[PDB]
Design a protein around this ligand. Structure first.
Ligand code: MN
Ligand code: MN
Ligand code: MN
Ligand code: MN
Ligand code: MN
Ligand code: MN
Ligand code: MN
Ligand code: MN
Ligand code: MN
Ligand code: MN
Lengths: 377, 377, 377, 377, 377
């Protein structure tokens, strides 16, 4: 059918040419709640509305501050690699966090003490590469598709430093001198960057492990998130990885949230920093409460990026018949939330009653235990 | 069917949950031309991805720098009024330009010399209200739906000053003193803004014209754009309104472009300023050439806002079976373009040949006359 | 008596040590109108709260963006010269406008074509010195006290270039070479700036007029404001000087307003730019209407600077038993206002009635003629 | 010999490894005048301290805000073309002004109305290309070397839009459609930009003139500066080109100054804007007087860029045995200066005497006529 | 001879007046490597191109963001003191790090707990003064010349707070009250700052040590860098001082590098922050790799400041017949580098081979041990 921006006696039918498919995706934007008011910045952007960089071996597309300007501190890439395909040895200024949505990959990293770390990452696993440390990704037999998050919103997929690009823009006599070889011995160096390139599947992980004189890295750069015990509440599950458990992840704190049909990520805020969101699957709405009677509701589905500025009140409701699965990402050394329910539960009941103009029947339902995801009765 | 980000031996199938409806809308983004390269800011945003403010009498939604950050100088509102409905008497810092897409409306404006202008605007007509001059809009019997453009990208639909809001936040004793009336005589003033409100259809325009001691306004604030003779070329039509013909329109220059199926707005740039676009109907692609081998292709359809930063090379191709109709908007006192074809046509042929590594067979097709819209052979 | 921040059942007595003299000066700030709401920047600053630079021959104190940060575009100095005292030959980046409050002075200016202008300025007269043109001020037999306005809020009373400071920081051999004199002939040049210095009263103006080969300046740099015919309305008078009458005053438009006891500068706004205010005498309150239900009331008296950001609604009410006299200053080539009364007077009465929920008894009082200052019945 | 930073009883010998060649070039920096004081930004940069971009047909090097950060509004390129060599058809956001130091060149420009201008420029001639208008340069039989000035300090020699780069990053099917040709007919288009390329010398200018249906350009884009009558004073000559004589040059005002040995560009300032300088030949020093007892002396020679911020006092002294030749450039529609001598000459003598603590013997030397360049006695 | 900007069939001879001495100093700028491409900010500035402030007792010159705008975080002063001469007791906002190039000096510092530290510093020694802690420098019998680095690029050698300047701008009655003395007892206080002043050589260090009731400072403010064991590699030596060994040096990490003739500081980057460089002696070139095929080569010699923005790839090659000696400075709590050689050495050989299109003959030369300085075969 044909939705219209009408809510009771407010609004009217659309009389101009329009985007009915987008309107159907955004029911709470075409017809917002009556409780939305005021100007709030855009908090939603789809990867499907971005240019896809296609290469021999995969693709990459990005959502940055040039797409979603509220998100000044965090940017993201959706990258896909075919089986065996290599994301070329490189480094950048930004720290990088990743979630493996599909398939598997082998990653390498060498630190500033010359210690190497090589590991395989599968679905529901993470990595985190500290700023400036060089690394690579190679998809295994299934290929790989993953979400990358960088701790600067201004991230530009080509301020990125590629091994072969560096060598291509260094005098041959200097490269030769650097390694103690002749110019002739390095004549076959590539003339331009590879970036993403096809390659044969690697061998077993155990055969690739490189030993060295500098020892083992003190902390691993990968994390098995979905192998951890989640916080389980009536309507879903929350798995948290921050610097307290994923020790190297100093600048990125994360949570994977699953919300059953008929459930919602409860009313809460974050007392530490901005939330950046990625919608892996399902369909949601969220109202962002911005203070001073400002609130705006957004719809999200698979492929969408969301955002909640620092300490703004919000919830995330499953509005579909499949599980809703999304990530909550923060540029911090820890994950923290304040639950509306738990806050009020921990105050004197008559004090809460004085605020809400409600009685004991209400304060009696409050829970001193935090349930991040609640289920509709 | 199910589109995939594959172009020959580049790219791969999407393995994660995705937005197939958006992918279908963006065929040149999911699979860009091989000639696209480099980072370019986002130049596309849909009104359908915005919150719709619903009121008794209509609605309004906006695309600003908070949605499309490349557009720092220009912002827009899509506003809809039911028959008789009134957009409340108000003013703002920004100059306002408008295009009537559907229906008709009566506008009022009073200038800083106390001269009034009241007129009816129909489909294909414009208005322009200089910064700070107070005005109103009232839809006639068909209702009205129109595109508003404001000459600051930071425009906020509530930095806007409403008559009733001003009075509601002024002491009653001051209002009384201002008009020489008692407080009792103004006790029925509204306690809050109206913004958009239902009202009876007005009478004939001739009956509303207000005479005064200060004379006629020197220049009209409305323009009948589609009543002008357009530039007609093989594939379409261009109608231009800038300060040279629509004399009051000092800060906004505009063109309505119609592109037939199988036609394209030719390769050109603007030597004066940034282009802001609104897609009224149809389906397009445009490649934005950003210099230094940077180029990025965007898809557009009805409801979309586009942008072309100052002097960037571009074209707009109809990729559908209906006419493509769009506006080209500029924060300037004039419209100007440089045509690629006309530029090369006006140079010595052997000089052009030396640049393009092409011969007389090519330079022979060049035209010294500018054809803004060309048709495919 | 002892005022308290109490308005009906709102507020409470002050329990901490306090500034009762300031509270008495600010009755509409300690107890604002109930109609004030929201956050508005500070729009008030007293010259009495500034450091006074004392010199042999006078003093100078300033209100800049470092004191009143809302005022980014305009800054001011209150300067006083004793009889005969000289404000040293100097220039600066900013254009300078002045109002002579007390006494009289002789000014000099030489333009970029070597044309000189020398004139005497008395009470109620203005000057304006274009950016970069060098000038001086010398008080006559009464001394002089005047208000200077500069067209940058960042003005710093010592980014100012003084003749003697320039020479003191130029090599003596270069000064000698510049003038064709010996180093010995310029040995008595001052070692540091004079800035303000005592001097004998000058002779008659006619005896100082310097003739030259380059002709007369095309436009005078002084204006007799109080010799013009003012706009006279029931409650007071307005005298306007802008580039339309004071031809050289391209970047500063001004109005001197006098408001009788029981009168008020009517509800209005400026459609062109920010208003900067100086309170010469008397006592006022003004409510600044900032949109979106934001309004804040300020008190002013002699020595105070005020401000009204671009297009904000306001009035200025005399709250004392003496005339209120103030300046309205604008960084523009013209003065413009929109009167609330005149605006509504020039619209169809039933349309105004539909907005205000008031009848013909109200619309019947509206005036098509602008009365800048109205008197209480 | 070995200069030392010693001035009387101040300073000391340099004890660390040092740059004696640079010290010899900068005698007034290693040993400044005793009258210099305070912090002043750097106002000097050499083209010899820049990377030279070498191409088949010439070279180009630039001084921008990334080299000389005081100069935010103006940037420059030193470009050299071999005989016949072509600076590829291109356009950019910035207006461009040029001075032909060596040789000659043919320029083309086509405006936004499709009117073409083609002309030959020799030594001492100028051009000016308005922002966004496309143009080219081709060296004649002597080759050419010229100074380009752009009206943004942030200018980047590759935000520049090249014809062949645009076509290389446009889909072939679109180029074909644009011109009404087949893809095969344009298969030989270059795959990358040319920028500067070798070519055969052109024919006579008269044979290249392109006629068209759109008429002659209203104003020429070249100017014969050294064919004008200069202001001649005792020590040198000044030739001025601004929008008053070189009518198209709206954003750049210029003066070529020649200063004989033993002469100096007199003590002056500019009341309009910042001065940007290029030293064509000879050796200079200049003291920049920055107000508040801040002054700093700089040395310049051939290849150096200088700067004088808006209204700062300065002189330029020939400190060599050959003529000093330099350009004074301003981002404005006019050239203006205030002469120290002429300023004081046009004031009452006793008033000047009261300031300088000097007598009639000094004021008697002052000249009411402006002499931009004076000669040492 | 006369160098020319010619590289094979690219470039051309210089036809305009030029700076041949500077061209000789910059052979890799006049004729860059063919591998340089793109726009890179200036990364080079000479102390010889700065104003030298001469005082009785020495001199000081500075390179700040006003000279080298890429360096926003770090600024430097080259200061020279004669025997016995004193850099006046002072403090500033910035932390200060120093390297003693010539001679020796006694420093004092008193901390916020009233603990004093007095020590002698000789050639190759460092100091570091935390932000805000007051200090002095007095040259011993040889005099002293040293490089100071401050942890803000905006450092201004006179935002610096001098003891005697503070007292000169404090009311005498307050100074008297502060110390319990009469105004007469302090009448001989200086009227202006000393800054640098001549004085008799001090006595032995042991005789100056001041005891107090507050104890010993926990960490020393001086460091004997050249007394540490360096990292020695085939072509040179590296001595590192950061907060891990020079415990107080929290905001500055440093390395003194010596590179033998025929050697080079190897291809590396810093994963932590920007590098600021000072060239103590010898002659170098460095290519800075900026990503996305941007690279630019710079020449340096004694007296030059260099810079490498965060994580950019670089090397520093000795291009002379004497040792090259330079400092690498970082605004961080630690020194870190990633070696290109070591990075590749610690990865699987076939993976490196897949990237470089080279075989086992190349990967066989890689070293798992880091050699910061390598020697040409
Ligand atoms: Mn990465
Ligand atoms: Mn959350
Ligand atoms: Mn409006
Ligand atoms: Mn266009
Ligand atoms: Mn002045
Ligand atoms: Mn006003
Ligand atoms: Mn150009
Ligand atoms: Mn000048
Ligand atoms: Mn210090
Ligand atoms: Mn380094």
């Amino acid at each position: 059918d044909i939705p219209q921006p009408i809510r009771g006696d407010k609004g009217a039918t659309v009389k101009i040419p329009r985007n009915i498919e987008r309107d159907r995706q955004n029911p709470d934007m075409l017809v917002p709640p009556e409780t939305d008011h005021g100007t709030v910045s855009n908090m939603k952007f789809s990867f499907s509305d971005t240019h896809n960089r296609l290469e021999k071996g995969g693709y990459a597309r990005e959502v940055t501050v040039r797409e979603l300007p509220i998100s000044e501190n965090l940017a993201s890439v959706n990258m896909r690699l075919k089986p065996g395909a290599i994301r070329e040895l490189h480094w950048h200024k930004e720290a990088e966090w990743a979630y493996m949505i599909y398939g598997s990959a082998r990653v390498t990293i060498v630190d500033e003490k010359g210690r190497s770390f090589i590991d395989d990452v599968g679905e529901g696993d993470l990595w985190y590469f500290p700023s400036g440390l060089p690394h690579s990704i190679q998809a295994l037999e299934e290929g790989a598709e993953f979400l990358l998050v960088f701790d600067d919103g201004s991230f530009d997929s080509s301020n990125t430093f590629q091994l072969t690009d560096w060598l291509a823009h260094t005098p041959k006599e200097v490269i030769a001198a650097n390694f103690g070889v002749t110019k002739e011995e390095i004549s076959n160096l590539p003339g331009k960057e590879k970036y993403i390139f096809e390659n044969q599947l690697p061998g077993s992980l155990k055969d690739d492990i490189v030993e060295g004189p500098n020892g083992e890295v003190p902390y691993p750069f990968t994390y098995r998130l979905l192998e951890q015990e989640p916080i389980e509440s009536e309507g879903g599950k929350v798995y948290i990885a921050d610097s307290t458990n994923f020790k190297v992840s100093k600048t990125i704190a994360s949570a994977l949230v699953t919300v059953e049909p008929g459930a919602m990520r409860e009313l809460h805020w974050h007392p530490n920093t901005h939330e950046w969101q990625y919608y892996i699957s399902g369909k949601a709405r969220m109202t962002v409460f911005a203070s001073d009677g400002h609130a705006r509701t957004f719809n999200y589905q698979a492929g969408d990026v969301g955002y909640v500025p620092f300490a703004m009140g919000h919830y995330v409701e499953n509005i579909g018949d499949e599980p809703l699965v999304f990530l909550e990402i923060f540029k911090d050394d820890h994950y923290a939330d304040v639950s509306l329910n738990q806050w009020l539960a921990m105050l004197p009941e008559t004090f809460v009653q004085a605020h809400l103009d409600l009685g004991k029947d209400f304060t009696d339902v409050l829970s001193k235990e935090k349930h991040p995801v609640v289920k509709k009765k």
